[PDB]
Structures are given as C-alpha cells and as structure tokens.
Design a protein around this ligand. Structure first.
Ligand SMILES: CCCCCCCCCCCCCCCCCCCC(=O)O[C@H](COC(=O)CCCCCCCCCCCCCC)COP(=O)(O)OCCN
Ligand SMILES: CCCCCCCCCCCC(=O)SCCNC(=O)CCNC(=O)[C@H](O)C(C)(C)COP(=O)(O)O
Ligand code: SF4
Ligand code: SF4
Lengths: 119, 216, 383, 84, 199, 45, 135, 90
C-alpha cells in the first residue's frame, strides 16, 4: 500500500518525534519553529521520492539516521544547522519570483565565467 | 587460545615437517574438497607468512562467509584463531566494485590465509562480530571508508572521519582533497566549513612510459 | 535500586573517552578516535613507491624504521628482490635499536602517568644517545627514511659500531638503576598488579600481539616463528609471564629490552663486509659516482627518480614484529608505478578496541594505567 | 465525548488553515486527506503533528496511520480521555 | 623483587579471591607464608618500617650528588653529523655560475610537492631557471631532492636555527636560496668532501 | 591453444570479475550518486 | 623461554609449568588426561555421523580422529602425547570439543550439496627462480 | 656498575666529518663489473601465474596424509628455522 513498507513515513515520524529536543538543545527557539522545521525535513525527503530500489531506500534511511544522531549528540552546533539545513531552504524559496526581471542565465553571466561550485 | 609456552629450552625449529608440508601444499585442495559449496575461486600465491612459501586465497559468497569462517576457526586442521584485519579494495570497472578482504593467522601451525567477498555498493555483507571480536571496529572503518554495509552489526557508525562527514573517502571517484575545507570566522565566532579553494592546486605528474609492459 | 549509569567525558586534551560509572566502578568505555586521521591511505595512491615511503615514519613515530620495514618487505616480495647480507644485518641492528627506543618511552611514560617522574628523565638521555645513532646514519633524528627496497639507503659511517658498543656496554646498568625505583616498590605494585587482566583466549579473540601476548603465557614471537632478514641467525630468548597483568607486561617489556641488547651485541660482532644494496639497477638507484660517468646509470637514475620502478601485478600481506605488536601492510598492485591500494594494519588499533572489556570493574584512576599499558600511539591508530 | 464537537472542529480548521500546500477555502468539516485535499503520507504526518501541537497530546504511529480524514481526527481527539 | 602478596593486588576480584581461598599458594610467583619467628620479623620489617621506599630514596639521593647532562644553549651546542638535513640551499660552481640546469628531477621526486620550477633559455643559450620556489611549510625535510639532483645544486645544509615570526618569511624563492648557498658554501663543501665517499 | 597474458596475476583478476551473483549487480540511473554522499551539484557537470 | 619472575622455578615439574603460564587459571583448572582426550575424540567420532557417508568432510574428520586415537593408544604417558601432537593436553581436549561442536552448523549449512558438474578454478604461482636458477 | 656520561675522548673521539681513515665503499660486485647481462637475473619479470585445471574430480586421499605422520616422540621431525633470507650470493 505504501511502497517499501512505508519506511519513509516511519523515519519521518521518528525524526518529527526527535525534533523538539533538537530545538531545545540547540537553542533554536527564537530562530525557527517546529512547523517550519518539520516542513524542511519533509522537503529533504521528497528529493528521493523517485527511488525505485528498496536497498537504496534502506541505505538512505541509515545515513539519515546517522545524521540525526550526530545532531543529537552536539557534534554539530547551531551554526551548522544554519549553514546547512534552513538557509539553503530559505534561499530556494526566497529567490523565487525576484524583484528583477533578469533570467538566471544573465545573473550567472554577470557573476563569473563559470558556474558556482557548492554552496 | 593456543601457542602456550611449553618447551623450556630454546627451539631452533618452526613447525613440524608433516604439518608444514600440509599447510604449504595441500591446504587449498583440502578446503576445496571438504567444503566445496563455500569456495568459488582459489589463488595460491606469494605467502603472507614468509618470502619462501606459498599460501592460499579463498573466494566466497556473502551468503556463506560466516559458516566458512567458523569452519576455518574451529576445524582441527585449520585453526585460524586470529583475525588480523578486515578491509576493502575498489574496482570501478567491475559490476561488483568492492572486494572485502579478511586476513587470518593460525598460531597452532604457523599459517596464514586470505578470504575475499565481492559485493557492489548496495549488497550487505554479514558481520563477523560473533565469530571474531575485532571484526567490530574493522567493519566500522570499512563502512566509513568505502560505504560497505555490514548487516547484523551492533552499532555500525563512522569511526575515523569528521562528525558530519558524508561520503566515503577511499573510493576511486572521491577526490583526494575533498569538497569542503575548514577555517575560523571572526564574525560568526565559530569554526566554519566552506567550499574548497587552494592557493596552489595539486600538480598531477603522468610519468607512465608508452613502452612499459607490466601495466594491467 | 534502578541505578542509571553516570557518564563522563574524558579529555579533548588526542584521545576522547566516554565512560559510564555505577558509582566508583566503570561499566563501559567507548573511545572516540579520528582526531589524528589525516587520510594517509588515500594519499599513498597518489605517490610512487619511493615517494610514499616517508609516510610510514609518521605512523608509529616512536618506532620509525620498524614501520618502514613491512612496507619495504611487501614491495620486495612482489618485485622478487633479494637483499644482500650486510643490509640484512644493518636492518636487524637498527630494528633492535628502534625497539629499545620504543620500550624506553613506553615504560617511562606509563610510570609518569602513574606518578613516578624521575624514570622519564633518566631514560630520555639514553633516548638522546640512540637518536644520535639515527642521525649519524640518516641525517634525521626521527624520520630517517633509511630502509629502502633492496637494502638500506647509505652505508654505515666509519666509527658507528665503536660507539654503539660503548652505549651497549652501560645500557644494562641504566636498566638496572631504572628498576630500583619501580620493580620492588609497593605503590607501583598496588597500581599495576591484577589490573586489566588478559587471558590467552581473549588475547587471540581480540587480535592481540606483542608484549601483551607474551604476558598471558603465549610463546609467539614473529622474529622466531616467521623470521625475516637475519633474525633466524640471532640467538635470544622470549620472555614469558602468566598473569596477563600490567605488572607482568612491565616485566616482559624490561626483559625484551635486555634481549634487544643481546641481539644488538651479536650484530656488532658479525657485521660483514660487502654490498648494502641489491645490485638490481632497475630497482635500486646507482651510486652518485657511477651516475656521473656511465650512460646506463644516468638513464636509470633519471627514470627511477621520476617514474619509479613498476611493481608486477599481484597482492601480498607482510608483517613485522613491531615493538607494539604486529604491524602489517596489505599491498595491492595492478602493475603501475603507484600502489593501487595500501592497507595499513596497526596493533594499537586492535589493542585500543579492548578498553571496553578491560576497564570493566576498574576505577577512574586505573583507566590511565590501562591506556598506558596498551602502548598506543594515535598516528598508527588514526591513519 | 470528553470534549465538545464544535470548538475542536474549529480548532482543527484553524490549524489546517496555515498549510501552504492546502487551500484555505476547500477545507470542509468532513473531507479526506488523500482524494480531496491531495496529501501524501508525510503531509498527513505533518498535519497530525500540528494537531498534536494544538491539543497537547501524543498520537502513536499506528493511530496516526489510521487517521485519514478531518472527521477521523476530530473523532480521535474527542475519544481521547487526556485532551486539553 | 617481583614477588606477589595476598593483599597487594590492585583490583577487587583477586583481593576477594586471595582472602577466601588458598589458590595463591599454588602459584610460584607468590611469597610464601613465614614459618618461624625470624621470618615473621623479616616480613613485618618489610611491610612496616618500609625499606623498599628507602632503596629508591638512596638511589635518588645518589643521583642528587652525581653529574648532570644539561648543555647551556646557545653557548653550548649538541652534536650532529655531515649527513644532517637542515635548511635547503642552492649552490654555485667556483667560477660563480649556478649549478642548477632546470632538469626538474627534484620537483618530480618531492613527495610533498614543495618545489615549483619554471625555466626558459638564457640570453647566452644556457638552460637555467627563472623560478625556483621551496615552500618550507610544506617541506618534510626528507632529502630526496638532494638525492635526485645530478649536479649537486640543491642541498640541505647544516642550519637548523631559522625560525621566523611570519609565515611569508618561510616561502623561499630562488634569490634567497642562492643567498643561503653563498652564506653556507664552505661548510657544505667540507661536509660533501666526506659524504662523497659514501654516496 | 589459449595464451592471452597467461603468466601474471591478471588471470586471477579477469575471474573474480565473473563470479556468479556478483557479475550481475546493477543499479538504476543516478542511484549510486545518492548513496555516494558527495554534493549533488557535482553531477550537473 | 625466559621466565620474568626473579625467583627460581623448576619447570621440570609439568604442573608447575602449567600453573606458571596460566593454563590452570585461564583455560582449565581440572588437569587434562589421556582418558579425557580419548573420550572427547570418541565424542567427535559419534558427532560426525550426522554428516553423509560419502562426504569428504566426514572422511577428513574421521581420519583426523583416528590418527589422534592411534597416537593416544601407542603412547601411555601424557608427556609423550604432548611431544607428538605439539600442545598441552588441555589444548587438545579443547580442540576435540570444538571440532565436535562444529558439526551441527556445517551439517545445517550442507557444503557437500553441490551439483555433479561443480567446478572451482584455481590459479597457482610459479617463482622465477624455478626457470632462472640451477635445476 | 657502568657510569653514564663518559668523559673526554672516551666516546665519539672523532667527529663524523673528521674520520681518521678514508672509506672505500663497494657499490658493485666484482662478478658484475665486466659481465653485465641482465636477462639471466631478471627475477622481476620471470614469475608466472598458471590457471590450474579445474579442481573438481581430484582424489584427496586422507590415508596417505595421515600415513606420513609420526606416532612416537622420537621419529618426530621438525623444520629448522631459516638462518637468513636469500641473498643470491651478494
Ligand atoms: C619525610 C617523609 C617520610 C615518609 C616517606 C615515605 C612515604 C611513604 C608513603 C606510603 C606508606 C605506606 C604505608 O604506610 O603502608 C602501611 C604500612 O606502613 C605503616 O603503617 C608505616 C607507619 C607506621 C610505622 C611503623 C609502626 C609500627 C612499628 C613497631 C611498633 C611496635 C614496636 C614498638 C612499640 C600499610 O601498608 P600494609 O601493606 O602494611 O597495609 C596492610 C593492608 N594491606
Ligand atoms: C536536524 C535535521 C537533520 C535531518 C536529517 C534527516 C534527513 C533524512 C532524509 C533522507 C531520508 C529519505 O529521504 S528516505 C527515501 C525516501 N524515498 C523512497 O523511499 C522511495 C519511494 N518514494 C517515497 O517513499 C516517497 O516518499 C513517496 C513517493 C512520496 C511515497 O508516498 P507516501 O509518503 O505517501 O508513502
Ligand atoms: S627535502 Fe624533501 S620536502 Fe624538502 S624540497 Fe627536498 S624532497 Fe621536497
Ligand atoms: S636543483 Fe638539481 S635536480 Fe633541481 S632542477 Fe636544478 S639541477 Fe635539477
């Protein structure tokens, strides 16, 4: 009924249960809310919505687990969450329909001769 | 638990003639004949123990790695009690690009052996934690460096790389210098990871002769 | 009652430990490593075989030439290269000098961690003498890069054996005055006796080697069971104890220093005259006078210092009785002038994995004794 | 019946209103999450987490997996003896 | 001595074992029970009144009245050899022409990639470098460049005292390396007159 | 007769590439980059 | 070997040697004898009957046990069996018990169940000194 | 009791740059000065790997293997430890 045992929604539920402790421990109470954090983590899951292999799904869930305990054990601080999780999301939803009529090509043209590498 | 101190005199000998002859000559055929379904390929080559001998290499499937290792530990003629390491080698040209390699030492008869399993990136290898207690950290390192998943491990987590490190560095398609680098920011008052920039890029010297015959 | 474990973080300042206690008694120890992981196994794939040799000095940097030995032997086996007699004797002599340096540092750092400060200061002057012996033959006090494929890099300078004999003539007196402070002392015994016991079955199940293995009643020395270079000619004893104690490992390490002195004395009297490098010019570089006078030598000098020799395709694992245990290199060759894969097996990596089962039932002041008696260096642990 | 069937309904509508992928006027007191509102499983989990945040409860994985409708959520909150 | 006692056991399982069972009497490394009065007095003079602390104290008091091994740097120095690998330097012929001929062998052998070389032909037709950099903060001081050089142009000299206050002072270019060679030439030649018998 | 580089370790490399079960490993498109863990913009090149 | 204890230990008494190296404390406090070795080897000979008669594994285990029992029969003292089989008898009894323990796991896995046309390629190594040095 | 710290000229009497006797280091064997042919000593490129015939219907006789083993303390034969690794005469 749900593809590959519904493991994506089970892992999403586990992370959503883990989330308020992350917000308290990393002191992100006045930076982001739990609703937008849940939406962001949901947006991390949709990027692999077209995986056709269950073993890739299991590996992705294992790797996402290891990411969530390295956030739980304070091995990455709040600035890591800022620079890796929520500002890429806000950049992907903030630049949409900008105040200028320049195409993405012309912004890339005026920036440099080559495409940007990384974030 | 073997090789207890028994002789109180100085020993000027290594092994006995019959057991050394059996180990250095007949062990490949013996392992193939006794447990044929476990063995898919064998190589007898230049001998981990010494420069003067030959020693076998056994290829097996992941479905029978644990029974073969239990047999090689507990059989009376092959008492391989010590597991020295677990590692992997990447062969990107193959359909299954990884070879997981197990080295063993027999203190009872001064022997060594090598055991190989071929898997790709998404096929799990059974853990040998219950057979050998050192298999834990070596499987953790192999998962860290190559991304080989060991099923049934108690706590498979990375052991060597950085805390947020995604990516398996010992693969052939991973760059030598990586993707990110680290510096201190005075404004954020934190040590921050940034995309890689090099003051002097790495110079790759291609030395290989177009007459050389040994390249395989 | 339902007593939860109290946990503790033990040192960022390069071992990190996460302990659990049930009062004053430890229930769990989890080492967190990788603070010295510099990725040397990846970097060796981008070097030629001569280029990657000084990486091995920086793995166990208390015992350098022994780390070089196994890499050189692994290359020599696949190349089918024979080492001449004088080079084998030089390699055995400097391997035993290296073992003496390592055991001096290990015992005195252990006794300083326990609390005795004077034996450290007494043993480091002897360490300075052996560093002068390293420098007189290689020009470096620590990272010598002395052992090469097919032999050693340079010959022994005239006057070295005279001074090695003069040091070896008084080293037993130094070891004697070292033991007067520690061996028959009740505080050292009460710190070391019956602490962190290892039986033989646990030693083989946990991949142990070296002086740990000999203190649990196992007669296993790689210099006597699978000998390499001229170690089969050497006459020495294997020290054996039977408790698996910190105290027994300390006694075994002192006796191993005595036996290394015996091998050093034997090498000083049987040093032969002859070649110290293999005469295969397609592997070993020529002499500097020969390179400046013959065309074939200059061609071989040019090619061996740029492309390097090509190792034939194959694989091997070669091990050496390093002063911390079995140090091994797994070399995988595809046929090029660069290693395809070079796995490094370190004994301290396997010895540190045991801290969860060795520290159970001990107290906080015995963790540092266990770490000191395992003889760990994090360069070889974190490659 | 531990709580009324009107105030819980408007509170459900109030927390359903602030969803960016939902329509603020299509939401009905008796609808479906799948056919009507067009939500997959993760959106359903997010909505149930919002309902849990508003009513101060804890809904397990199986119970939240059984909830597939606005009426189902209202009936589960009403049947819960620990509601606020 | 290396003997053991019931009571001097550092742990608890062995302490519990020695006081409830006599299995320690079978072990040959244990000290036996005293059998008469004089042996009891010897054991008590071992445990009480110390006498094992006193032997170490006598040794350290003998060391207090002994000779010392400290040198007074920088008025006194240590001992080194002509093979010592110190600060890199570039050399000349006795005429004053550079020995280096831009073969790029030392740049190829360098495992640290600490050497950067560019060259063209000089106005008299000679083959000479226009850039010869050594990153001393990348160098590993192996001496492989000294081995690879066929004209003895690059050496590691006998200087070890060259610590600076800025890191830009440790990125040597060609001119500074020639200045180092012009400073250290006589010592380098004296060292190489002995080390050419071996190399 | 058959002799195509039949005197070196490459014989033991050609087989071990055709071991059954491991000679038929296959993944879908772009799937190995998802599990590689390197940044995803690298595969736009 | 060299004993690190500064006391003088006989080591001709075999029980003292077994005490000193930790066999009594760490492996077996009960002394192993010739009869216990015979009993353990007959336990292996009984346990191996779960394997098929035509299997090479059964032939290998049976031949090893028969040789061990012949050594036990032709030697009365336990020092002679120590000198022949190159171990302590506690080690040999542990070996036989481990071999008997191994049999049900191998029998459950059934390695003998290969097809009739089963094939295993083997690659062997020949040194250069075979053809270069003197015959 | 041998004393640490020897006095003047009792240790390192000559510095290594002032060796009292000139050194003559051999760098080649006298057998190879005028006989320089290489293919008779090319050990690197003369090793072989051979694919064995497929190890299927071989006859492992365990009777012969256990018939060559001793049964008495005397008649036990031991392989002596090798004194040196091969030097090939150099
Ligand atoms: C200047 C500084 C001076 C101190 C320098 C040395 C410092 C040593 C510190 C460690 C001392 C260890 C210690 O005191 O051990 C105790 C024995 O010694 C003692 O108890 C020693 C103190 C008492 C001295 C002797 C008292 C009795 C003498 C005779 C009295 C009767 C006749 C005359 C009336 C107990 O250790 P243990 O092993 O015995 O513990 C029995 C259970 N394990
Ligand atoms: C502090 C922040 C740290 C966060 C780190 C954790 C991030 C983990 C993210 C990685 C985990 C995954 O993507 S797991 C991989 C998820 N993709 C798959 O499983 C392939 C099948 N597609 C699906 O399952 C889709 O969700 C769908 C088609 C909508 C099914 O519809 P429903 O949903 O109705 O069931
Ligand atoms: S001494 Fe070593 S690191 Fe320094 S320039 Fe020469 S080769 Fe490079
Ligand atoms: S210093 Fe020597 S090796 Fe380096 S480029 Fe100049 S001549 Fe060549």
């Amino acid at each position: 009924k749900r593809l590959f045992g519904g493991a994506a929604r089970h892992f999403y539920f586990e992370i959503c249960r883990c989330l308020p402790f992350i917000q308290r421990l990393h002191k992100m109470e006045e930076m982001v809310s739990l609703k937008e954090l849940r939406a962001i983590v949901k947006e991390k899951f949709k990027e692999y919505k077209d995986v056709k292999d269950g073993r890739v799904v299991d590996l992705l869930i294992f790797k996402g687990r290891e990411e969530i305990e390295t956030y739980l054990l304070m091995h990455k601080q709040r600035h890591h969450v800022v620079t890796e999780v929520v500002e890429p999301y806000y950049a992907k939803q903030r630049a949409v329909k900008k105040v200028t009529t320049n195409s993405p090509f012309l912004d890339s043209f005026l920036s440099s001769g080559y495409a940007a590498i990384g974030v | 638990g073997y090789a207890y101190a028994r002789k109180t005199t100085d020993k000027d000998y290594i092994a006995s003639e019959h057991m050394q002859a059996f180990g250095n000559t007949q062990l490949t055929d013996y392992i193939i004949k006794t447990v044929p379904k476990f063995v898919k390929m064998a190589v007898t080559g230049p001998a981990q123990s010494s420069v003067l001998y030959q020693e076998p290499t056994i290829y097996t499937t992941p479905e029978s790695l644990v029974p073969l290792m239990v047999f090689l530990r507990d059989h009376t003629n092959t008492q391989f009690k010590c597991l020295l390491d677990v590692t992997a080698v990447d062969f990107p040209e193959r359909a299954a690009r990884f070879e997981v390699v197990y080295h063993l030492l027999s203190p009872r008869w001064n022997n060594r052996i090598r055991v190989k399993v071929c898997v790709d990136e998404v096929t799990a290898v059974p853990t040998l934690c219950k057979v050998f207690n050192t298999a834990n950290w070596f499987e953790r390192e192999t998962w860290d460096m190559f991304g080989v998943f060991f099923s049934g491990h108690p706590d498979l987590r990375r052991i060597l790389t950085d805390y947020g490190f995604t990516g398996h560095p010992l693969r052939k398609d991973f760059p030598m210098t990586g993707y990110q680098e680290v510096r201190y920011d005075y404004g954020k008052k934190r040590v921050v990871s940034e995309p890689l920039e090099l003051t002097q890029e790495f110079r790759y010297f291609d030395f290989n002769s177009p007459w050389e015959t040994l390249n395989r | 009652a339902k007593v939860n474990n109290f946990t503790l973080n033990f040192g960022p300042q390069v071992l990190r430990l996460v302990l659990e206690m049930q009062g004053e008694i430890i229930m769990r120890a989890d080492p967190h490593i990788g603070l010295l992981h510099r990725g040397t196994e990846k970097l060796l794939e981008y070097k030629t075989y001569l280029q990657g040799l000084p990486y091995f000095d920086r793995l166990d940097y208390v015992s350098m030439m022994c780390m070089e030995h196994s890499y050189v032997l692994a290359i020599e086996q696949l190349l089918n290269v024979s080492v001449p007699l004088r080079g084998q004797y030089i390699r055995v002599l400097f391997s035993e000098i290296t073992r003496v340096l390592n055991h001096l540092l290990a015992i005195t750092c252990h006794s300083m961690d326990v609390g005795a400060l004077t034996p450290f200061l007494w043993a480091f002057e002897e360490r300075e003498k052996l560093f002068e012996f390293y420098e007189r033959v290689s020009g470096a006090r620590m990272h010598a890069a002395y052992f090469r494929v097919g032999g050693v890099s340079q010959d022994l300078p005239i006057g070295l054996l005279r001074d090695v004999y003069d040091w070896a003539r008084q080293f037993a007196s130094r070891l004697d005055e070292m033991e007067e402070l520690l061996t028959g002392n009740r505080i050292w015994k009460e710190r070391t006796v019956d602490v962190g016991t290892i039986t033989a079955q646990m030693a083989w199940d946990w991949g142990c080697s070296g002086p740990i293995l000999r203190a649990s009643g196992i007669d296993w020395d790689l210099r006597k069971t699978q000998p390499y270079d001229a170690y089969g000619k050497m006459q020495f004893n294997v020290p054996i104890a039977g408790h698996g104690d910190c105290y027994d490992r300390y006694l075994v390490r002192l006796q191993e220093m005595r036996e290394s002195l015996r091998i050093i004395y034997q090498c000083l009297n049987e040093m032969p005259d002859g070649l110290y490098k293999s005469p295969d010019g397609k592997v070993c570089p020529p002499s500097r006078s020969t390179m400046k006078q013959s065309m074939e030598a200059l061609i071989h000098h040019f090619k061996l210092y740029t492309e390097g020799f090509h190792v034939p395709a194959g694989e091997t694992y070669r091990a050496v009785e390093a002063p911390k245990g079995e140090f091994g290199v797994y070399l995988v060759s595809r046929g090029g002038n660069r290693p395809y894969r070079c796995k490094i097996r370190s004994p301290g990596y396997a010895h540190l994995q045991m801290t969860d089962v060795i520290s159970r039932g001990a107290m906080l002041a015995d963790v540092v004794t266990i770490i000191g008696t395992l003889d760990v260096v994090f360069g070889e642990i974190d490659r | 019946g531990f709580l009324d069937k009107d105030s819980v309904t408007e509170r459900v509508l109030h927390v359903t209103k602030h969803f960016e992928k939902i329509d603020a006027s299509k939401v009905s007191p008796a609808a479906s999450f799948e056919k009507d509102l067009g939500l997959d499983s993760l959106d359903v989990v997010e909505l149930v987490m919002a309902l849990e945040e508003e009513f101060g409860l804890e809904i397990p994985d199986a119970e939240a997996d059984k909830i597939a409708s606005v009426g189902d959520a209202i009936n589960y909150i009403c049947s819960n003896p620990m509601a606020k | 001595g290396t003997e053991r006692r019931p009571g001097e056991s550092g742990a608890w399982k062995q302490i519990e074992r020695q006081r409830y069972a006599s299995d320690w009497e079978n072990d040959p490394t244990f000290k036996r029970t005293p059998k008469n009065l004089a042996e009891v007095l010897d054991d008590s003079a071992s445990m009480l009144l110390l006498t094992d602390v006193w032997r170490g104290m006598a040794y350290t008091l003998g060391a207090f009245f002994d000779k010392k091994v400290t040198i007074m740097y920088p008025f006194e120095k240590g001992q080194l050899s002509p093979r010592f690998r110190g600060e890199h330097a570039l050399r000349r012929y006795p005429t004053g022409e550079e020995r280096c001929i831009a073969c790029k062998l030392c740049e190829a052998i360098c495992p640290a990639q600490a050497i950067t070389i560019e060259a063209e032909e000089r106005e008299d037709g000679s083959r000479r470098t226009t850039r010869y950099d050594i990153d001393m903060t990348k160098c590993i001081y192996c001496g492989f460049c000294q081995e690879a050089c066929p004209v003895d142009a690059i050496v590691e000299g006998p200087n070890f005292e060259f610590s600076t206050e800025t890191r830009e002072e440790l990125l040597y270019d060609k001119q500074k390396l020639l200045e180092n060679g012009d400073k250290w030439e006589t010592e380098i030649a004296t060292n190489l007159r002995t080390e050419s018998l071996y190399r | 007769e058959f002799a195509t580089a039949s005197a070196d370790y490459s014989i033991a490399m050609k087989k071990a590439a055709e071991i059954t079960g491991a000679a038929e490993s296959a993944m879908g498109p772009k799937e190995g980059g998802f599990t590689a863990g390197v940044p995803l913009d690298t595969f736009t090149r | 070997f060299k004993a690190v204890a500064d006391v003088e230990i006989d080591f001709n008494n075999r029980e003292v040697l077994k005490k000193y190296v930790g066999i009594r404390d760490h492996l077996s406090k009960e002394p192993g004898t010739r009869g216990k070795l015979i009993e353990a080897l007959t336990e292996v000979l009984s346990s191996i009957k779960a394997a098929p008669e035509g299997s090479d594994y059964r032939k290998a285990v049976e031949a090893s046990c028969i040789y061990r029992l012949k050594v036990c029969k032709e030697n009365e003292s336990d020092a002679a069996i120590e000198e022949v089989l190159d171990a302590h008898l506690e080690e040999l009894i542990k070996e036989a018990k481990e071999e008997a323990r191994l049999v049900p796991l191998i029998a459950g896995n059934a390695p003998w169940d290969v097809p009739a046309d089963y094939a295993v390629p083997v690659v062997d190594y020949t040194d250069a000194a075979t053809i270069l040095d003197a015959p | 009791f041998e004393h640490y710290l020897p006095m003047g000229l009792e240790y390192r009497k000559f510095s290594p740059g002032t060796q009292p006797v000139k050194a003559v280091v051999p760098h080649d064997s006298p057998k190879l000065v005028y006989d320089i042919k290489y293919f008779v000593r090319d050990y690197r490129r003369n090793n072989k790997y051979t694919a064995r015939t497929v190890d299927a219907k071989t006859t492992f006789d365990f009777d012969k293997l256990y018939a060559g083993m001793p049964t008495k303390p005397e008649q036990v034969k031991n392989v002596t430890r090798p004194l040196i690794m091969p030097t090939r005469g150099y």
